[PDB]
Ligand binder design. Structure first.
Ligand SMILES: *[C@@]([C])(=O)[C][C][C]([C])[C]([C])[C@@]1([C])[C][C][C]2[C]([C]([O])[C][C]3[C][C]([O])[C][C][C@@]32[C])[C]1[C]
Ligand SMILES: *[C@@]([C])(=O)[C][C][C]([C])[C]([C])[C@@]1([C])[C][C][C]2[C]([C]([O])[C][C]3[C][C]([O])[C][C][C@@]32[C])[C]1[C]
Lengths: 326, 329, 326, 329
């Protein structure tokens, strides 16, 4: 289960925040992909192709598939799990894309939430991955994106049929249930106020109401030196302890890492639970030229970065997305 | 306001943490006090003196009085808030140890909760509480002491009469009401189970229940690299958001920093709500010799640190405790 | 705000329960209407007409409009307030019916939930009443009906467009919000269980979850001597104290009366808060012949009935429904 | 289990009600006892005797011992449950008044809480608790007494030591834990406000909070016709559903009947969960003369009544209290 929230500050101040929780280690890493690069939405299926128009920084999943990142044009994307997401019924002859690269496609071809919604509602392809290949627990997610202007759009495939809700009023997103209900739930908690009562359980829906109430009670300021820690605080509030385990639940999904993107100033921020220090990357201080080279920022070996870990950027081989089932 | 809890792990692993919530800036700092330092419990009233037994690292608040820290013997003490507090009735005439140095006196002259339990129950000195009318809240608090053995003790002068609670079970504590109630109220939610319901509200009791439930659920492991993060994680959870304001409730005490101690290894980790990195100080690499010098680690000007901030210490003169209500801002 | 719940007992055991709460006195009464009677869906508007096919007993509203009742064929109807119910936008040339008689129409022309749904989805008319005529607080409701078989159908007009949900799994109904959300809310409370935690507030949505969990934990028995009090208990649980008043809320809507219908055995049950005793009426012990006469069962003057208040039935003039705005 | 609360209205209006929840049938009944009836606090142990001062209407449980009632002086007493109860420590040798007649002895020999407060604090007699191993829960309860003046008192033998709480504020009481905690826990929800949140759960504390909040919100009126229904309304609210069963929690104590008293007018209203009408008995129309005769109003066979059930009383012999653990069913 994961959550993501977006802050709408004065003077185009847009800062997004995404959570990462998983049962075991995620082995995620940060890769930087300049523009002018082509990719295939799938390797063993009929698929579409494109050409990376913008550079961006994203967080990987075991070095297999992107699930969060921010592009040059202050636009951030995030994939959160949704236990009731189906992408297509039989009879789909469209170019089958794979859920592993769904994220990467959008960031490489979009810079404004408006434009992204347009091409998506064409359903020009079906994006899928086989079920429980590695005996995994679940394998179904939904994505959220936001531009440096403050507009956001939640996307979910309802048993094959896409389901999208666009607008700036929608700035938080958890796992389950369906958003229309996920939001309807909050209607009840808002009347009971947040101060006089606030549910502290860890269920997917519970994490939603908390973020909603706090992300508004936060100070309405356009400055960037303060909003960043403010966004992370609620991320820490919504974040859950690591290594939890009760008699009923033998193993649990713990808070592994979180991400925040200063979409107004184009600065991505990333933190790991088992790390003491906080680092960041300034996209404006990054050469996304067509021929700049792929520099990786590894985190598996437990490296400890901090500050502007741009000097620590090392040229590395872009992780190969996985559409097979092994 | 704040919230404190203690973790009890195998292999003598006992990690304690603390939270700090304030409506404005605390302007806290950090100072070092080698052993063998005489001190007076007050500058103008009849109070005892002493010479620091064990060197102690303490975190200051406004550079007037220590609010939390440690000493040379895995003895971590913290001072939280409590409105319904009364230290003495009209007529008390004992030595009135100012509240500003009460904690420091403890860390200085104690290394085990059992000892402090004794010297405390002697009821030798009163507690001096200054009163101020211009934007100042009267001093009404309580304290908690934990030993590297894992034994904890709660102290609170309830309506002029002090009540102490010792034991290893007693590991969590928050603002109000009195622990006699807070502990029992929590037992209610215990029935409900944390997985199913938990008062996520920022209120005192709400935080107490959440900390109590999670502190057990966290991993019980003897390794420090794992238990420490598992601790601060609940610290951030119990910690309320930063700078919350509502039209009805305009100002609210917001979190300003968190403190964690590895009493099993004598380490102190510190982070601020406005400081991204997490620095620490290895007490073992310290020298508390009587003539080692008072060392300060300023933070008023917003200095930034990370890792082990041993090299970045600068000797300075001891701060000045506050025993009498300030005349004005 | 009002609530209604339906019990599905073994061997076609169907018993419905409806709540009544209002700010001040309701001045309601119980009228019996045999079959073979004609009515007009509105007096000053183009309207449809029919001929009462079955007899039934209903509870009136100030002696102006029916809001609850049970027919011969063990089918019960109930109108509950819904603050977000609109019945038609401009351009409605259909026979305008009035919200006051909407209830009476269904009971007089239906005996099975299936048949009722059919004719309703024709939208052959618009049923409306002018807004705040007597300075009233609100004036928008939704209806729930159930046959002696156990099938129920909730109905709500979404800004003119009807909204219906049919099935036996839907046996409880409160005021707000919309049902699709009103039910989605319960999804959260069911996971938290009812025993280990149950919200006791009085808001419309809160009253829903309580009834849902209890109406299932109740014993699954086909006997009728016990299920009746069981249904009323939750009605008492969902029922709220009378004359409540805090500093914030100066006057409140108190629990005035409740109703339960033994749809399997065709027996209607009614209780008033300010009355000590409980009475009932056995439809099977009632002559709904075309020419039987209208016998009223008054309750305004605070009469105190009990037991089988059929002997207390007195021939009276059927209350005239109100479509005007005075 | 059960739950009790007291309403305080102007013009000396004080209406008290009670709830009864049991896993099976209580087989309760009703009996009348005119004044001037000698009684012994036990049949086989050393116990005091007495002669009933004030006639008292009591509701029996299994026709063995009174669980609630009243006397000739607007003095309504009730007996609720409490697991963590201890009446005396090993070695007590005082008069051991059986728990079955403790209540009756009170109503018989008292007319004001102040008096009972005195005679009770004398600590003259112990409490006899029988122990049974076959489907029987050991007797562990507490009591509450209210006077027509509106003053209430809570009594509970906590770990062999009795603790009393008197006053007009103390009007609500439930199962567990001890009122010292139950009262304070409720103060928590008080913060949350009843309109915004209320633990609708059937648990002991949940019911206590709901009753406390609503009992104030109900109409404060001097007329009986209005206050009485406003009372029983909260009684039904606090009352848990009937015959609840879950696969995990199979059997649960369900509500069986509710009792209300108009202490200002000396009336007793009674209803059963399986009885639709609400009958009552006007104590004023009663004769408790010493030789008036013990009168019973049976309910085992499920008789049905309504209105004022004065005419439908049938004289019978007094029931038999239980002082010793029954040999078997
Ligand atoms: C959140 C919680 O905000 C995003 C979570 C995403 C990154 C993960 C849930 C995801 C998609 C990553 C990869 C794994 C997914 C499934 O659990 C199936 C596999 C499980 C295996 O343990 C690792 C690789 C898979 C593909 C997983 C939910
Ligand atoms: C429930 C709560 O289950 C059914 C409630 C129905 C019977 C009432 C809400 C209703 C329709 C009855 C009549 C009155 C309605 C409005 O409040 C507008 C008027 C108010 C006035 O005080 C009495 C007559 C009106 C038509 C009312 C909601």
């Amino acid at each position: 289960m994961c959550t993501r929230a977006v802050y709408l500050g004065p003077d185009r101040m847009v800062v997004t925040g995404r959570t990462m929780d998983w049962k075991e280690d995620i082995m995620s890493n940060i890769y930087v992909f300049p523009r002018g690069m082509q990719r295939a939405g799938h390797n063993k299926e009929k698929t579409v192709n494109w050409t990376s128009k913008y550079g961006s920084v994203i967080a990987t999943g075991y070095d297999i598939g992107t699930c969060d990142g921010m592009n040059e044009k202050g636009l951030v994307a995030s994939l959160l799990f949704l236990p009731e997401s189906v992408y297509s019924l039989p009879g789909d002859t469209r170019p089958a894309m794979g859920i592993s690269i769904w994220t990467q496609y959008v960031l490489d071809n979009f810079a404004t939430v408006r434009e992204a919604v347009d091409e998506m509602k064409k359903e020009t392809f079906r994006i899928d991955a086989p079920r429980m290949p590695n005996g995994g627990p679940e394998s179904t997610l939904h994505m959220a994106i936001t531009d440096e202007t403050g507009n956001t759009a939640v996307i979910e495939y309802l048993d094959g049929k896409l389901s999208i809700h666009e607008g700036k009023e929608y700035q938080v997103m958890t796992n389950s249930p369906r958003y229309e209900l996920q939001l309807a739930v909050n209607d009840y908690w808002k009347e009971v106020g947040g101060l006089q009562m606030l549910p502290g359980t860890n269920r997917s829906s519970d994490r939603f109401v908390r973020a909603s109430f706090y992300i508004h009670a936060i100070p309405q300021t356009a400055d960037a030196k303060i909003a960043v820690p403010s966004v992370l605080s609620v991320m820490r509030n919504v974040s859950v302890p690591f290594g939890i385990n009760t008699p009923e639940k033998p193993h649990i999904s713990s808070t592994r890492w979180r991400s925040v993107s200063d979409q107004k100033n184009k600065v991505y921020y990333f933190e790991s639970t088992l790390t003491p220090n906080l680092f960041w990357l300034d996209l404006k201080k990054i050469d996304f030229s067509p021929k700049a080279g792929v520099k990786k920022l590894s985190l598996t070996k437990g490296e400890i970065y901090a500050g502007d870990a741009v000097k620590d950027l090392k040229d590395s081989q872009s992780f190969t997305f996985l559409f097979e089932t092994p």
